[PDB]
């Protein structure tokens, strides 16, 4: 009447720790908060089928929170719980291959996640947290459920809430290795003069104003010095740039961009689709694929590939 089984506990699914569990007590009474493949089992009692299975638990000793910080690059005590709660849902999403890319069937307002996912497969990016590197590898392969859950946890967003593609990519770039990325800008006035600026990291591969890359290089008008100065790109060193602006009708031409985010609807309650440039223009809407030779639509982000740009101005 006091049976026991052997199981593994973990915080990272890479270091496993053998545990003997009393089948006469719940998991929470022995481990605290405890999860099996996302599902919360803190209040469940052991079952014969759990022998050998692996269980996530919360970092409750020093060894365990070293392993957790080293895999996730966060000390936030709630992070594991949110990741498990998210994963409990995303493991039931469907991740079809669509035009050679892993996508996500629409559920729970996950259009923005799909668009992020599709984009990440088209640009050169190296994540620092091993959790993101391993899940991304899995995602690329076709099984994105851990990756999607990790994004929600890194972003403090829950299943079913629509999020912002630009903001999500900004959170993720903040965990990617962009050290060697450099942008150089110049702002010129008719009255005042040249005021050069330099940026690095995620700020050198992002923008919030215009959706065109040529316009940025040519110049754009922006405000205290005088009135409406011009801002233009002097130098860019990075594998990609991301040009964003509030959604507006916009024409996309094959060969002149890598991919982009179409947004239809109102602020914070709309719908994203993902436009990619391959041999023709494709539109990937979760699990649905359409082709066109041209495109006119409400676009709010555009990714261009890059290596090194130097102005002639
Ligand atoms: C879908 C969504 C989810 C969450 C958010 N949160 C998250 C938290 N953040 C502090 C603020 C905004 C925005 C959008 C959104 O809809 N983002 C877009 C956007 C859509 C529509 C409009 C935008 C405007 C300015 C800027 C962005 C706009 C004016 C009208 C589609 C790109
Ligand atoms: Zn001025
Ligand atoms: Zn490149």
Curated annotation (Swiss-Prot):
Catalytic residues as annotated in Swiss-Prot or TrEMBL: 111, 271, 285
Regulation of its function: Inhibited in vitro by GRL-0617.
Mutagenesis / variant outcome for changing residue 75 to L: Increased cleavage of ubiquitin in vitro; no effect on ISG15 cleavage in vitro
UniProt effect for mutating residue 267 to G/T: Reduced inhibition by GRL-0617
Residue ranges of domain Peptidase C16 in the record: 71-313
Subcellular location: Host endoplasmic reticulum membrane
Effect of residue 66 to A: Partial loss of ISG15 cleavage in vitro
Function in brief: Responsible for the cleavages located at the N-terminus of the replicase polyprotein. Participates together with nsp4 in the assembly of virally-induced cytoplasmic double-membrane vesicles necessary for viral replication. Antagonizes innate immune induction of type I interferon by blocking the phosphorylation, dimerization and subsequent nuclear translocation of host IRF3. Also prevents host NF-kappa-B signaling. In addition, PL-PRO possesses a deubiquitinating/deISGylating activity and processes both 'Lys-48'- and 'Lys-63'-linked polyubiquitin chains from cellular substrates.
Subunit structure, as described in the record: May form homohexamers. Interacts with N protein.
Name used for this protein in its record: Papain-like protease nsp3
Higher taxonomy: Viruses, Riboviria, Orthornavirae, Pisuviricota, Pisoniviricetes
Range covered out of full length: 1564 to 1877 of 7096
């Amino acid at each position: 009447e006091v049976r026991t089984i052997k199981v593994f506990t973990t915080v990272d699914n890479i270091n496993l720790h053998t545990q003997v569990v009393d089948m006469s007590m719940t998991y929470g009474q022995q481990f605290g908060p405890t999860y099996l493949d996302g599902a919360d089992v803190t209040k469940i009692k052991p079952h014969n089928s759990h022998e050998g299975k692996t269980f996530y638990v919360l970092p409750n000793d020093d060894t365990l929170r070293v392993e957790a910080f080293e895999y996730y690059h966060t000390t936030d005590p709630s992070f594991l719980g949110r990741y498990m709660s998210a994963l409990n849902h995303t493991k039931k999403w469907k991740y079809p291959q669509v035009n050679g890319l892993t996508s996500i069937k629409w559920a729970d307002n996950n259009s923005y996640l799909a668009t992020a996912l599709l984009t990440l497969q088209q640009i050169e990016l190296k994540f620092n947290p091993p959790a993101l590197q391993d899940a991304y590898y899995r995602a690329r392969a076709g099984e994105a459920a851990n990756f999607c859950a990790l994004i929600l946890a890194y972003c403090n967003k829950t299943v079913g809430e629509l999020g912002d593609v630009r903001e999500t990519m900004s959170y993720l770039f903040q965990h990617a290795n962009l050290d060697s990325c450099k942008r150089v800008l110049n702002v010129v006035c008719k009255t005042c003069g040249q005021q050069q600026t330099t940026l690095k990291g995620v700020e050198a591969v992002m923008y919030m104003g215009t959706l065109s890359y040529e316009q940025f290089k040519k110049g754009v008008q922006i405000p205290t010095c005088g009135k409406q100065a011009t801002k233009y790109l002097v130098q860019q060193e990075s594998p990609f740039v991301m040009m964003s602006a509030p959604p507006a009708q916009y024409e996309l031409k094959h060969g002149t961009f890598t991919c982009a985010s179409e947004y239809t609807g109102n602020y914070q309650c709309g719908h994203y689709k993902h436009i990619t440039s391959k041999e023709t223009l494709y539109c990937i809407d979760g699990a649905l694929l359409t082709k066109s030779s041209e495109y006119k639509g409400p676009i709010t982000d555009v990714f261009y590939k890059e290596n090194s740009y130097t102005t002639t101005i």
